[PDB]
């Protein structure tokens, strides 16, 4: 097929490349609409439907079946977020930040925002609780690196809030996910391993002040943790990265 | 701040032997070792493997192809273990010369051994493809891995099976040396004008770059939202948490549009798969349809003059 | 009363003191060497 | 009162990094001079003492 | 004081605040810019000490006579070669 | 138009330079101080590209090319029609790329999350800056930068590649290619594995992350894990960028012959030198 | 005349910092535009 | 006319930011275009006028 | 009474008046500059 | 006719921004197209007409 | 009396009238410019 | 009133007067620089 | 004494003493070596 052309200089190669462009436009349409199964329809800044919705219409509903008798999930769901957010707009126009109306960390807004997940523990493939204290797992042991248990924990101001007393591990993926802190405040606390640095003398948490440690979102039980509790704890620390940054030295 | 790049403390319990969802357990080995130098980066368990009919057959055919390439090297070294080691990268098992066309009648040390080895290499990759399919089927999973592997195999087969047949000569297939197949790539671009002016070579590069860039972006995104239960990507697909939301809002605020937890993997799947799919198309058209991509670009208005 | 690095306040002072001494000696000896290599082969 | 920085930053990492940087800077300045056939103390010696 | 100035002094406190702020912005910009210029000048200086064959590479860009904006239609940077 | 969960994340804070002066959104896009600078740099660079195109003879967007100054100008600023437009665009490009990263930092600070994304993009920026700044400064001429054009910068890639014979024989180039190929393979496998678990065979419940560990352990004997695959993809891509930049930096600065002759250290080892 | 009301919409601290940045950037544009012209470069 | 009602539609903070960006960009572009033309480059024109200024 | 920005009609009028004074000053300077440039080197 | 009812469909802010962007890009493109053509490049034409202006 | 934008019928009318005045002013300036350009360098 | 910045009317006037003083000082120094350059190397 | 290096102050002095003895011994051997090389083939 060399030198033999359709249409007067339109080749099998020209045909192939134009065919690819057509297919790729269709694939971009497909990919974009697949990626619209969360967060749509667009809202306005008062919780009502937005005037504009974009060139791409929403995809057809798709269902996920969940193992271990945890029902079905269909998306896009067209539902609005199932939590109230203690903000208030700073301008009558659009495109400007909304300001917290109370304590941003206690209310759960901004970088401290939590999503309303189900109040049940995430499960492993065998239907057991996926993240548990090692007192429950009981076959897990420290394999390498330094064990943080017994070390003092130091907040983002250089003050010690307590000691590491327990690790919470993921039994499916063999990982430590939380450090249980016993507080001199008087109670206990879970700290995400992703937010703690273990050193020889202490575990240092550079996101949360010592006063913040007095109010960390609690868990109902000390043998399992729900996805909602996980969201609240991790959101509290990630929000501290903004709302506690002034307590740092200097 | 802890960058989730390396694990701080490793932990280990009973070794995990796998899910049982229709896998023939007697084809799954039983021995795992736990290697902590890997546990700094990823999992420490060197787990069991599954070994059934397809895997055994694929390994036999591939190992025999490997062996035959090695034997050819030994023979062309004139038996010298010194030349064999000195030329481990510079030697190749080359296809038959052009005068033999597509016939199976070329001397054993001038393409015949190349043909035999190529046949067994063909057999093993197809059996490995069937393996990728059947391991998914035995667990009840979708077939995305096998489809993605089919795209890469398509580039492989246009390289040495489809295009040499359409050109009428085994002599255009790629040799089995480390340095000689790079020489083959350079020669291929040089004989077909310049392969930069091949639009499907351009599109293949775009998807290679984009797949590298996309997985820089996605790995960085997941690591950045790891403070939240971020890398548990499954279960964020069905129960959206703040990790998925903040990941979406980062890219929405940055570039004006975002993906979803499930859908970023479709983008990556398609960008990765389209690299060999589009590349194979461009090689197939080279020589068969276009002889000189430079003059073709000049005629099609994207090379000057 | 524990720090981020584990140093106490006192260890920090003496460490900073010796750090300044080390830098002072490095710069002074470098100055001397530049003087010598200027008197030898002027540039 | 600057010493408080050593309560924040680990002196071990900082000291090693600064040492490596100064060492490489000195090494590459020396390589400049030895590459330059005007200072090049070795070769010029082979002319000052006539191969010494 | 829920305002970065309240009493203000109306001519001197405000003037010092404004001088401090504008000088801060200009000074950080100056630091960044001169650091970058120094880095480039240092790289050029270092390149002076590379082997002479670092100056043998030909011009790597093709002038296509349809992109040649020098003034003359010749397919090259005129007045040089 | 906000996503149905977006409102609770649109709070003040996280900025680096100008406080609440630019702390607002324009449609989806966060602006901030570096959004202003990135928009200005991007617009000025695009608009100088268009102006340079106007001075040529084609409006075909595949033939437009802005060329670096000739070598005779060295590292000086060229007359604006003799390479100066290229230098203006290059400075605008650096300004916009750096501003884009700083804007990404501010968005990460507002949504309190790690800074991995601007870090990775900075690796991409470093590859670009190696191409247009670092290497031409060491060689002593801006004209060793690559011409700006959809198909003419490929002419640059070609000419520079064939200056050192076949560029394949560049060990850092080999390392970079392997990292590009491997990151593409890893993206394919990771996307496929996620999709297979989330989209099972018809009628089956959704698969668990145990099933996907099991899938790779069955297929190859090893599973890096969910956290591990993202660390791996990130570092693979970053290393590909860095070793590509080292590849090109070495060529013409410290190595000058055909790259094939570099391996003569192995081929001329004295025991098998003469064989 | 009434241009002082600009400070009712834009906070003066931030504007001062931003203006310092902008003025330095404008200066560098002008200086190296001058360096581009052979007849106005003062280095040589 | 009664164009003042633009300020019932567009907020002044963002409008002023966008206006400043656009106006400075347009001024820089026009000056650059004039510098690139060898009939309106004032530096070279003055070079010729005074015999090297 | 349509108001997106939150202003009243009076504040919009006052704001527009000041804005127009600024715009007219800028345009007057630009007109003077163009007249000077046209005398110096006409382009039509 | 009664085209005002477009404002019951489209938001004025989005439409005005889109219109401004469109008009700016259109005007830029037309001027650039004129300047690239040496029959409507006013700078060079004036150079010719006034004997190098 | 429903609308996508939330504007009332009266608000849309005054909006449209002001917008039309603006468009007509723009168009009349463009028309004068085109007459000038056509007298100077006719393109048809 | 229309106060985004939280200033009062009187604070804005005083800060504007200070800003004007600083800006005229900057312009006067710039004028001296331009006169020196023009004497040295005139560009018009 | 869970110090960062697990040592004590008393152990620190003796370890530093043997360190300084070795260091000065190495430096003295180096200086006499440089003296010999300078006499043999001055640079
Ligand atoms: C002088 C050299 C030429 C050139 C000539 C070619 C040629 C010739 C080809 C390419 C191809 C490719 N080129 Mg090139 N190319 C050049 C310049 C470039 C530049 C550059 C910056 O200059 C870049 C980035 C690229 C990039 C690319 C890729 C996008 C593309 C391959 C895609 C792919 O999937 O590959 C990786 C995937 C594969 C190789 C598929 C096969 C792998 C199989 C599946 C492996 C299975 C297992 C195996 C059998 C056994 C071992 C396993 C055991 C465990 C041990 N080219 C210049 C112009 N290029 C190819 C293409 O698609 O072109 C359109 C191709 O054939
Ligand atoms: C004749 C040609 C030569 C050759 C000569 C060269 C030369 C010369 C070079 C390479 C380089 C590379 N080559 Mg080679 N190469 C050849 C053959 C190959 C083959 C092959 C199969 O044959 C392959 C796979 C490769 C592969 C590669 C990569 C390792 C590398 C390019 C990646 C890179 O730099 O990313 C780096 C990424 C970037 C620079 C991108 C930066 C992006 C910036 C930050 C953002 C831009 C935004 C944009 C303006 C925005 C637009 C806005 C829109 C809204 C989107 N080469 C042959 C043998 N190759 C290059 C390299 O290593 O470069 C460092 C290089 O210079
Ligand atoms: C989307 C496109 C990308 C991609 C996709 C892709 N590749 C894939 C997959 C996918 C989705 C798989 O599912 C499949 C896989 O299983 O991956 C883990 C595969 C895979 N891609 C691979 C490689 C690969 N992919 C490449 C490319 C890419 N693959 C693309 C970039 C490349 C490149 C860039 O060149 C390579 C080299 C393999 C890891 C794997 C396929 C496994 C396979 O082919 O097995 C066949 C087996 C053999 C040839 C047997 C070899 C046996 C040994 C030599 C035995 C040694 C024995 C002893 C040492 C002695 C030997 C000699 C004698 C004495 C015996
Ligand atoms: C799990 O997480 C993940 C997601 O999310 C859940 C994701 O989304 C993504 C993101 C990835 C995708 C959505 C997939 C598709 C993305 C690509 C293929 C990457 C390539 C994208 C482009 C083609 C880039 C184009 C976008 C750009 C550059 C935007 C351009 C905008 C401007 C130039 C102007 C910006 C506007 C500003 C600053 C306004 C300023 C206002 C003033 C007045 C000043 C990733 C990685 C992710 O892993
Ligand atoms: C051939 O030679 C030449 C070169 O090459 C050697 C050159 O490189 C260059 C110079 C190079 C360039 C033009 C590109 C690189 C330029 C820079 C490095 C400087 C960068 C400039 C900026 C980023 C400034 C951008 C400023 C903007 C967008 C204006 C901001 C305006 C607002 C935000 C709105 C108004 C402000 C507000 C909100 C408050 C109101 C203000 C009050 C005073 C009150 C030139 C000219 C040259 O010719
Ligand atoms: C001066 C010239 C300017 C252009 C020339 C530059 C070259 C362009 C080539 C690549 C195109 C890049 C342009 C990307 C546009 C960025 C703006 C943007 O995408 O955001 C706008 C839009 C709105 O977002 P949203 O409202 O959320 O959409 C869903 C609601 N219905 O968001 C969307 O549209 C969502 C759809 C996403 C679009 C998919 C992106 C495809 C990129 C794949 C390219 C890879 C292959 C490229 C091959 C290159 C070959 C040379
Ligand atoms: C340039 C001249 C026009 C800008 C001058 C005035 C800008 C004022 C600041 C601003 O942009 O306002 C934000 C604008 C309006 O959004 P506001 O968020 O409306 O409230 C939503 C109510 N539904 O936010 C937006 O919604 C902006 C988007 C409006 C619709 C834009 C349609 C596409 C934009 C042009 C197409 C893309 C091309 C971009 C440039 C291409 C360059 C090659
Ligand atoms: C193509 O390239 C080139 C660049 C050739 C041509 C480009 C031309 C262009 C586009 C040029 C753009 C020019 C512009 C937009 C210039 C804008 C200049 C401005 C607005 C300058 C304003 C300066 C204001 C200052 C310095 C204010 C200082 C205020 C203070 C409070 C400082 C405090 C200190 C004192 C002493 C205050 C005085 C107080 C008392 C009591 C005396
Ligand atoms: C190619 O490069 C050219 C050649 C251009 C020019 C070269 C330029 C150079 C070389 C620049 C660099 C100069 C440098 C690096 C100077 C720095 C010298 C240093 C770091 C000296 C420090 C020495 C410490 C010493 C000598 C201690 C030595 C011995 C002991 C402590 C005893 C035995 C050793 C050990 C480790 C055991 C510990 C001992 C006990 C008792 C426990
Ligand atoms: C030969 O090459 C060819 C290739 C050049 C390239 C293209 C050729 C083509 C296809 C050209 C097509 C051009 C088009 C489609 C042109 C259309 C232009 C339009 C629609 C211009 C409209 C301008 C409208 C304006 C300026 C409207 C209003 C301005 C105002 C100031 C009105 C203010 C509005 C207010 C105050 C509303 C506030 C009211 C209330 C009640 C709050
Ligand atoms: C100590 O024992 C031994 C002897 C192990 C020492 C061994 C040394 C070894 C094993 C050396 C092996 C070295 C190398 C360099 C192996 C890798 C070579 C490369 C670069 C291979 C890349 C190949 C690329 C492609 C596209 C290959 C094949 C593609 C196909 C589509 C295969 C099918 C093609 C044909 C013609 C099948 C023929 C079928 C019939 C019926 C004739
Ligand atoms: C070759 O030709 C090319 C290719 C150039 C293409 C041509 C492109 C062009 C020229 C495109 C268009 C340019 C356009 C359409 C428009 C430019 C409009 C301008 C110059 C607008 C300038 C306005 C200046 C102003 C408004 C100055 C304002 C200063 C002030 C102090 C105003 C203060 C304002 C207020 C509201 C104070 C606050 C009051 C209260 C009560 C809060
Ligand atoms: Fe992922």
Numbering used by the authors:
A (entry chain H): 1 to 250
B (entry chain M): 3 to 307
C (entry chain U), M (entry chain T): 5 to 47
D (entry chain u): 3 to 54
E (entry chain X): 2 to 82
F (entry chain L): 2 to 276
G (entry chain a): 2 to 45
H (entry chain b), J (entry chain d): 2 to 54
Paper text:
The reaction center (RC)−light-harvesting complex 1 (LH1) supercomplex plays a pivotal role in bacterial photosynthesis. Typically, the RC and LH1 form a photosynthetic core supercomplex that is central to bacterial photosynthesis. The photoinduced charge separation results in the reduction of quinone to quinol in the RC, which is then translocated across LH1 and diffuses through the membrane to Cyt bc1, where a proton-motive force is generated to trigger ATP synthesis. The RC-LH1 core complex of most Rhodobacter species contains an additional transmembrane polypeptide PufX of ~80 amino acids, which is involved in determining the quinone diffusion and dimerization of the RC-LH1 complex.
The overall structure of the Rba. veldkampii RC-LH1-PufX complex is composed of H, L, and M subunits for the RC, α15β15 subunits for LH1, the transmembrane peptide PufX, and 62 cofactors. The RC is surrounded by the LH1 ring composed of 15 pairs of transmembrane helices of α- and β-apoproteins, in agreement with the structures determined by AFM and low-resolution cryo-EM. The RC-LH1-PufX monomer contains an LH ring of 15 αβ-polypeptides with a 30-Å gap formed by PufX. The PufX peptide is composed of a central bent transmembrane helix (from Thr11 to Gln49), a short N-terminal tail and a C-terminal loop. The transmembrane helix of PufX has a tilt angle of 43.0° to the membrane plane and an angle of 68.5° to the orientation of the 15th LH1 αβ-heterodimer, instead of being parallel to the LH1 αβ-peptides. Analysis of the supercomplex structure reveals how PufX functions as a molecular cross brace to interact with the RC, LH1, and cofactors, and thereby plays roles in determining the overall architecture and quinone transport pathways of the RC-LH1-PufX complex. Presumably, the assembly of the photosynthetic core complex initiates with the association of PufX and the RC in the membrane, and then PufX serves as an anchoring site for LH1 α/β-subunits to trigger LH1 assembly and encirclement. The results suggest a potential quinone diffusion route: A quinone molecule enters the RC-LH1 complex through the large gap formed by PufX and accesses the position of Q3; the Q3 quinone replaces QB, and the reduced QB moves to the Q6 and Q4 sites and subsequently diffuses out of the complex through the large opening in the LH1 ring.
